[PDB]
Write an enzyme that holds these catalytic residues in place. Structure first.
Site, PDB file in Angstrom:
ATOM      1  N   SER A  33       0.857  -1.183   0.000  1.00 27.29           N
ATOM      2  CA  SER A  33       0.000   0.000   0.000  1.00 27.29           C
ATOM      3  C   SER A  33       0.899   1.241   0.000  1.00 27.29           C
ATOM      4  CB  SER A  33      -1.022   0.019   1.080  1.00 27.29           C
ATOM      5  OG  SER A  33      -1.996  -0.936   0.654  1.00 27.29           O
ATOM      6  N   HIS A  64      -6.923  -0.155 -10.919  1.00 30.37           N
ATOM      7  CA  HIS A  64      -6.083  -0.557 -12.077  1.00 30.37           C
ATOM      8  C   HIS A  64      -4.609  -0.648 -11.685  1.00 30.37           C
ATOM      9  CE1 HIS A  64      -8.686  -0.879 -15.512  1.00 30.37           C
ATOM     10  NE2 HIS A  64      -8.745   0.403 -15.836  1.00 30.37           N
ATOM     11  N   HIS A  86      -3.392 -10.560  -1.143  1.00 30.03           N
ATOM     12  CA  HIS A  86      -3.452 -10.954   0.298  1.00 30.03           C
ATOM     13  C   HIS A  86      -4.429 -12.096   0.485  1.00 30.03           C
ATOM     14  CE1 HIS A  86      -2.695  -6.638  -0.504  1.00 30.03           C
ATOM     15  NE2 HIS A  86      -2.183  -6.382   0.682  1.00 30.03           N
ATOM     16  N   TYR A  88      -6.797 -12.021   2.629  1.00 26.69           N
ATOM     17  CA  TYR A  88      -8.167 -11.410   2.804  1.00 26.69           C
ATOM     18  C   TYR A  88      -8.861 -11.363   1.435  1.00 26.69           C
ATOM     19  CZ  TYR A  88      -5.996  -6.548   2.135  1.00 26.69           C
ATOM     20  OH  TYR A  88      -5.157  -5.470   1.917  1.00 26.69           O
ATOM     21  N   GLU A  89      -8.052 -11.320   0.396  1.00 30.11           N
ATOM     22  CA  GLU A  89      -8.634 -11.171  -0.937  1.00 30.11           C
ATOM     23  C   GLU A  89      -9.220 -12.465  -1.442  1.00 30.11           C
ATOM     24  OE1 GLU A  89      -6.227  -8.308  -3.485  1.00 30.11           O
ATOM     25  OE2 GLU A  89      -4.783  -9.061  -2.009  1.00 30.11           O
ATOM     26  N   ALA A 116       3.101  -1.659   4.780  1.00 31.34           N
ATOM     27  CA  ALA A 116       2.695  -0.553   5.662  1.00 31.34           C
ATOM     28  C   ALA A 116       1.883  -1.125   6.819  1.00 31.34           C
ATOM     29  CB  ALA A 116       1.905   0.550   4.941  1.00 31.34           C
ATOM     30  N   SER A 220       0.074  -9.136   5.189  1.00 30.44           N
ATOM     31  CA  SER A 220       1.029  -9.507   4.171  1.00 30.44           C
ATOM     32  C   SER A 220       2.435  -9.708   4.774  1.00 30.44           C
ATOM     33  CB  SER A 220       1.160  -8.332   3.264  1.00 30.44           C
ATOM     34  OG  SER A 220       1.339  -7.042   3.777  1.00 30.44           O
TER      35      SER A 220
END
Lengths: 289, 289, 289
Positions: A33, A64, A86, A88-89, A116, A220
């Site tokens: 991020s 994108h 990740h 979570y995705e 981050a 991550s």
């Protein structure tokens, strides 16, 4: 449950990658991020979106920005991942980690992993840069590990160690350099703990995370590091500290990473420059000294 | 791994629900071991068994008690879930949590979540009522989270916060009321930690659970709360304390919840009455004051 | 998610087992890294490789050593598992645990579980033998539990207790016996914590594991024990301590279990003898006293 990816699958993807780019990178960098901002710095940049590379976990829904740009950053030849993947995705860890394995077959010997975090150590300001020094894989404490299956000796051992994960040298060599550039605030060092799921850590949780003795928290960087080391890649990384996790009962103000205005800009710029003068400290295979 | 449930699926189930009931509830209540006892209190009660509602996770093996009764409890219009669903039962968290999402589309703004914990704080008697004040999701520390997949902005954000989960007001407003009714023993307050799997916590485990600083432990209530808040529902809940987890080496006597005779009866009756005079303290959308 | 194994499946496998062996064992022993060495001791030994038994999780990739040998060890009739199964190998816990369920239908009343841990208590030497006294299931804290599904009352309850898992008697009866044989070094006692995934615990992790108050760590023995007890089997076990987990920043020397030369030989020999004179202390169904 073996990895839905068979050794020939990486071979294939490397090759491809290696027949579309006159570039042979010696360093992969993984951008987190508000940090794909580093790809602006390359030279001889060559961009390939996931979608396009034969088995590459293609990206989801958020935007994108997520592709693989090869280029030249200060002397060393790197590969840079803009937009990682990740848990979570929805991705099995054999998907989040796939990239690392190809980088292996590209011929990468080193990997820098950015991210981050949330800081949890009471001496950290949003803005800070933490040298991950270690990790706490909770996901893995339970079998959520990327090495979970039949082993692939072409990749590695069965039971790789991790005392050792984040290079002592690149870590000393990083510390020195913050001297070199002579920066204002200090370059923190701590333990990085991972937590999966998308929602944020409540306050009893922030307190477990901190009793466990962690200093930053995120979603991550541990999968990728583990299978990076499984493969004998030299690993070192940093955390940009964006939030400052609440360990007391109160009315949080906060709402962003970098979205606001300079939150990720300001602090993200310094790490991007830091990462950029560090290329110089990374040994060069041609060890012709 | 996306949720096997697509937005149209909830739509469908709400609608249905909303074309079989002249009732529009403003509060969902979730009933836990020895607490479906609250559905006796409704008025204009209207009962629909899961089996019957279009995509509803249908119930397993333990008994004939688990259905959805709409009705009227003290002034406010509620929906009540008799017999919730757990992870131990074999359900993905996108199944345990489904109900909450429909309640969302019914038009529910508040959710009270009941449950019967194990107490771990050395000052708690079986019988006690604990205001959950917070949670510890271990299942989620590892990716076992209901928001794990592509996000559905029609439902919510990607990274919702939880510092905040259990309303300060309904929590003050609850505290006051135990004054009001002027009860004997005190209305505890603590942190609620979840643990999945069906077998019970051994004694080193009870000690981790307690060092983590939890006060009650169970096998429900966190999934549902998380996706409840994801949706901006006002959440508040309680724990009925049935056992009193052994943190020393000894010969447990214990064997039940409510099965015995008044175990769940006695203590369950007071919470049912408590929950019932609390309907009155819950704001009423018609904010015509 | 129910267990892909239906009650008739065990029935079947027991029967089979019971029509190929004139042997009726009263004790199952589970052998762990560098400990199949115990099968040399049997008498009237009868060997059946997994591959050959009707639904038996067949073995993976590491070597030719993993089969089921029936025989006679000191008076009692046992069944011994050479080469167990782990989560890291890719197996659902309803696969690692299958054996235990058949042993149940063989007619086994007792189970000894061996394993080779990492010690975490600062007073342990590689070589030591630890009487597991308790456990910490992290995998199970998150739903990775073998009892996760619809319950099979023919097997057991829904919510079995574990305060109680590792017999007080066989544990006193073991302690005494180390007197009997009059051994040099002491027979440790501690808590055993499980961790899934194949890679090794880093150093912040070794420290969580130790704050959680564990004394040894590994990647087996809890599933099998849980469903062993679910079934009312008498359980007792030991840990051979091979490593001595680093809780400080340093350059590990270590690299093996038993591979080196006497590492598993030396220490493994004493437990094999210990386990062998313990058969004698295990009650005999014919309680004709």
């Amino acid at each position: 449950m073996e990895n839905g990816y068979t050794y020939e699958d990486y071979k294939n993807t490397a090759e491809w990658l290696l027949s579309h780019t006159k570039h042979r990178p010696q360093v992969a960098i993984i951008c987190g991020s508000g940090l794909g901002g580093l790809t602006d710095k390359l030279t001889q940049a060559q961009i390939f979106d996931y979608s396009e590379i034969p088995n590459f976990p293609r990206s989801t829904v958020p935007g994108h920005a997520g592709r693989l740009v090869f280029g030249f950053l200060n002397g060393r030849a790197c590969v840079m991942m803009q937009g990682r993947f990740h848990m979570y995705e929805g991705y099995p860890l054999w998907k989040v980690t796939f990239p690392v394995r190809v980088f292996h077959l590209l011929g990468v010997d080193t990997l820098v992993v950015t991210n981050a975090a949330g800081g949890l150590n009471p001496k950290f300001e949003v803005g800070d840069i933490m040298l991950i020094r270690d990790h706490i894989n909770l996901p893995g404490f339970s079998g959520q590990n990327p090495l979970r299956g039949p082993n692939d000796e072409r990749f590695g051992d069965r039971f790789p160690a991790m005392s050792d994960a984040y290079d002592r040298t690149m870590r000393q060599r990083a510390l020195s350099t913050w001297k070199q550039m002579g920066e204002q605030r200090e370059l923190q060092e701590g333990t990085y703990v991972m937590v999966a799921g998308p929602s944020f850590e409540t306050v009893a949780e922030c307190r477990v995370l901190q009793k466990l003795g962690a200093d930053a928290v995120g979603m991550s960087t541990v999968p990728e590091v583990i299978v990076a080391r499984h493969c004998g890649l030299r690993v070192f990384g940093f955390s940009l500290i964006t939030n400052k996790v609440i360990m007391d009962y109160e009315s949080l103000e906060k709402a962003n990473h970098e979205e606001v205005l300079a939150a990720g800009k300001q602090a993200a710029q310094k790490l991007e420059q830091f990462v950029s003068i560090l290329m110089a400290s990374i040994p060069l295979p041609d060890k012709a000294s």
